[PDB]
Structure 1
Amino acid sequence: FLKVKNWETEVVLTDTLHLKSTLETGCTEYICMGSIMHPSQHARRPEDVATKDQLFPLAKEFIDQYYSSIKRFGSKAHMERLEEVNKEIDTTSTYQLKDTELIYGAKHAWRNASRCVGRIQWSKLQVFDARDCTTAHGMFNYICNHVKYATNKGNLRSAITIFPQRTDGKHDFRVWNSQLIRYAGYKQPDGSTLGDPANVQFTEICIQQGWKPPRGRFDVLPLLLQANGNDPELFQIPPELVLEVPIRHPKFEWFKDLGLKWYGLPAVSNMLLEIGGLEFSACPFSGWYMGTEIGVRDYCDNSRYNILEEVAKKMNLDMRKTSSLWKDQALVEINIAVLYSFQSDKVTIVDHHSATESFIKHMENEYRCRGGCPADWVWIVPPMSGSITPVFHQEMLNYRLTPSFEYQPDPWNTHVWK
């Protein structure tokens, strides 16, 4: 057992759930890597098709956990299912998840996402089974429906769409986009950058793939879909499905004249979903934004939109030195605008005070019913106003549970074309 204390309320939780931890965190008792982006390459099976003694033990574990979840350990259906995975693996070197197993594993991957502040909602995920897809066109149909359903005219709903699992590796389904909706980034001739600088390499892949770019600041990027390992394919998301919020300020009338907007749907599309030894290399999932993701990081990182110096000018701020806190002060007004805009257009959005409060409650709930909750303090603490949110003063144990979401290399580094 390992206790965790809240240094603001003195609540102490007692974690036993960590004992079911399978993968290495990256830490040793002599060195802590809690601030490394990807601390560990400890996967669960070799990079392409594993052998029977490699795959079944992972499969046996998940099926065990799922039947144990529904209070049917060792039942008729449980024992039959193991034997069924046994024969599938025998004759296909893989196995196929039942519909309910798919939904259980997808929801529980979200649940063990040690980095997601927005997990109090985990069991309310909508799972779209796309395991029957065969082409990039079909991938585009599935994604498009995802976006309509999730967006819900602004009343956002969490959803994941799950494309066929990895087989041998040279037949992967991928979304080459990192998120379903991102603006483009163009390397200007004078060395500067128009649009979103994180997406310059991807914006150039799209150009070199055929995309006519409008060469602006908020060009929604094309989807770039790969099916069954083949060459990826450009599709344009119908604009009427890309709900966008223009950013204005509840006080500074001049703010709208900055011509800033952002998209209302955050949909991570480049990660890998891992259930019982199976690897779903294409599993786009979406929810709704915490304000700070847009207004702190997207707008105010140096390597991102860097609107800070611009907004500070209009604020008439002494930018001669740092000790004036002109960056701090504009950062707040920006994140004030971003919130007030989304709420004004009735687009779902949550502020960092409301969401962190929820996660404290979610930790309670979890510790009380599950015996723990994995939590990555470095990522949970919002990137502005850290200590005036509850999460800051909350001790967090971090450990890796399966099912889970895993990083994976960008498909263009590992894809020989045709």
Structure 2
Amino acid sequence: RFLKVKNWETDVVLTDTLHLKSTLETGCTEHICMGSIMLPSQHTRVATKDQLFPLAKEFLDQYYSSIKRFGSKAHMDRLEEVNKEIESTSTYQLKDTELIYGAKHAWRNASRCVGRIQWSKLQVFDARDCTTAHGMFNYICNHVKYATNKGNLRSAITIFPQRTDGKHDFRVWNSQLIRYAGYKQPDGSTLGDPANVQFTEICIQQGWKAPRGRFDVLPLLLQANGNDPELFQIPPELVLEVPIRHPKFDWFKDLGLKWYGLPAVSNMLLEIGGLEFSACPFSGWYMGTEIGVRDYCDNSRYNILEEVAKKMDLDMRKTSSLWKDQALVEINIAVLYSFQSDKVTIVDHHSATESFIKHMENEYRCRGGCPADWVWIVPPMSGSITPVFHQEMLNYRLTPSFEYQPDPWNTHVWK
């Protein structure tokens, strides 16, 4: 009822009492830990009106507790107000301030997010008056423009209307607002990003004329109020990109790599007070490793370690010459150097993981804990030379929260 987490690099002990407020389940049991299942059935998302008020009551109780006015009359009135509206409409609507609070705390509670030290500096765009795919496109272009801020990236989320019935449902079909296309070739190999080959062909299935190259920014596929989704090209002037060079190796430009400045996740579900927002794209800035390690070096992604090690003149016959590791570091020095040389916000895994430890200290003191997923918080390279490797972390599921959801093209009753 009062759990301790240790840092074995510093011998610092934090005491977690926030996990007692926890609600949702984790997938782990007394006899099995599933802390390395990627998409647990508990992390994926259809609710009724009965269970709605406890969820609303719980959310309002913490919201008014956080504006220093818990249990007051303005609280007890809004409790009844939402109670009455849930009786009448079997749903309800958040105030603007309740929406901003819910969004920031969904991010705050995101236990797999290392970036959370900035959770309170999130810009919330209320798109709940949107009704059409063009409206969504317009709200998303504004989001992109604002969050990019000419390389001085800012955190933002845009929140489309909440689910109601289910078949009326706003969805961004893109997994990210800005992703590169993936095309299968004649021989079977892949041009561009192999992650998106399925989505890239869906866009061609709906009309996209593909420039069939590498870093072809995909179009947005926007579903409005359950209607069939529609294709929109983000104006290129809004899609900020960094060409990737190295500060030693001049052949690194010849690699011709580039990446988009803005990580902007669009397929998630935001849950606030029992309400489900099925389209809620949010963006921040990149940690170096997400591009240079995962995007560039996953076997199932661009998979460039071959060509980088070749041009580095590396012993590639022996696995134990660590040519893979050696080329991975250079690639990440290049992503960082490239982004910083262009004044595009980027953070290295050392700075970001140190900030997360600093963030954890804040959340244990002024909040009683910080839910954190070690499997995801440790960076995908050089893990133990970063402070998060040596920090025990308690993972538990708080709300408001971002949840996964099935892809719309497996559930959308088409036409």
TM category (shorter chain) comes to over 0.9
CA–CA separation in structure 1 for the residues paired with 2:42 and 2:114: 24
Which string of whole-angstrom CA distances, capped at 9 and with x for unpartnered residues, describes residues 88-107 of structure 1? 11121100000100000000
Which string of whole-angstrom CA distances, capped at 9 and with x for unpartnered residues, describes residues 354-407 of structure 1? 000000100011111111000100000000001000000101001000000000
Equivalent residue of 1:194, what SS?
strand
Which string of whole-angstrom CA distances, capped at 9 and with x for unpartnered residues, describes residues 323-359 of structure 1? 0000000000000101100000010000000000000
Does the 8 Å CA contact 1:24/1:40 hold for their aligned counterparts? no
| Structure 1 range deviating more: 14-23 or 86-95 | 86-95
Deviation, 1:24, is 0.8
Deviation, 1:192, is 0.5
Equivalent residue of 2:119, what SS?
helix
Does the 8 Å CA contact 2:336/2:348 hold for their aligned counterparts? yes
Which string of whole-angstrom CA distances, capped at 9 and with x for unpartnered residues, describes residues 222-270 of structure 1? 0000000000000000000000000000000000011110000000000
CA–CA separation in structure 2 for the residues paired with 1:202 and 1:403: 29
CA–CA separation in structure 1 for the residues paired with 2:246 and 2:40: 40
CA–CA separation in structure 2 for the residues paired with 1:311 and 1:235: 35
Does the 8 Å CA contact 1:148/1:241 hold for their aligned counterparts? yes
CA–CA separation in structure 1 for the residues paired with 2:250 and 2:72: 66
CA–CA separation in structure 1 for the residues paired with 2:28 and 2:71: 36
Does the 8 Å CA contact 1:146/1:161 hold for their aligned counterparts? yes
2:257 to 254, 257, 260: 260
Deviation, 1:39, is 2.2
Does the 8 Å CA contact 1:67/1:78 hold for their aligned counterparts? yes
Query: Identity over the aligned pairs, expressed in percent?
Result: 98
Does the 8 Å CA contact 2:26/2:42 hold for their aligned counterparts? no
Unaligned runs of 5+ in 1: 43-48
CA–CA separation in structure 1 for the residues paired with 2:263 and 2:144: 10
| Structure 1 range deviating more: 255-264 or 53-62 | 53-62
Does the 8 Å CA contact 1:26/1:40 hold for their aligned counterparts? yes
Does the 8 Å CA contact 1:50/1:93 hold for their aligned counterparts? no
Which string of whole-angstrom CA distances, capped at 9 and with x for unpartnered residues, describes residues 159-214 of structure 1? 00000000011000000000000000001011111000000000000001000000
Matched residue count: 412
Q: Which runs of 4+ in 1 moved over 3 A?
A: 49-52
Does the 8 Å CA contact 1:125/1:160 hold for their aligned counterparts? yes
CA–CA separation in structure 1 for the residues paired with 2:370 and 2:289: 23
Change (3 A) 1:295 1:24: same
Which string of whole-angstrom CA distances, capped at 9 and with x for unpartnered residues, describes residues 262-292 of structure 1? 0000000000000011000000000000000
CA–CA separation in structure 2 for the residues paired with 1:250 and 1:41: 44
Deviation, 1:50, is 4.2
CA–CA separation in structure 1 for the residues paired with 2:51 and 2:365: 35
Residue 302 of structure 2 corresponds to 305
Residue 2 of structure 1 corresponds to 3
Equivalent residue of 2:409, what SS?
coil
Residue 239 of structure 2 corresponds to 242
CA–CA separation in structure 1 for the residues paired with 2:165 and 2:10: 51
Change (3 A) 1:50 1:291: closer
CA–CA separation in structure 2 for the residues paired with 1:235 and 1:226: 11
Which string of whole-angstrom CA distances, capped at 9 and with x for unpartnered residues, describes residues 32-67 of structure 1? 00101122337xxxxxx6443221111111111111
TM-score (norm 1): 0.98
CA–CA separation in structure 2 for the residues paired with 1:257 and 1:304: 20
CA–CA separation in structure 1 for the residues paired with 2:113 and 2:231: 30
CA–CA separation in structure 2 for the residues paired with 1:85 and 1:310: 59
Does the 8 Å CA contact 2:155/2:284 hold for their aligned counterparts? yes
| Structure 1 range deviating more: 29-38 or 175-184 | 29-38
CA–CA separation in structure 2 for the residues paired with 1:398 and 1:334: 31
CA–CA separation in structure 1 for the residues paired with 2:144 and 2:48: 37
Report 1:13-412 matches (<5 A): 13-41=14-42, 50-412=47-409
CA–CA separation in structure 2 for the residues paired with 1:225 and 1:52: 28
Unaligned runs of 5+ in 2: none
Equivalent residue of 1:363, what SS?
helix
Does the 8 Å CA contact 1:117/1:380 hold for their aligned counterparts? yes
Does the 8 Å CA contact 1:63/1:276 hold for their aligned counterparts? yes
CA–CA separation in structure 1 for the residues paired with 2:159 and 2:262: 18
CA–CA separation in structure 2 for the residues paired with 1:39 and 1:100: 31
CA–CA separation in structure 1 for the residues paired with 2:96 and 2:10: 43
CA–CA separation in structure 2 for the residues paired with 1:258 and 1:167: 48
CA–CA separation in structure 2 for the residues paired with 1:301 and 1:318: 20
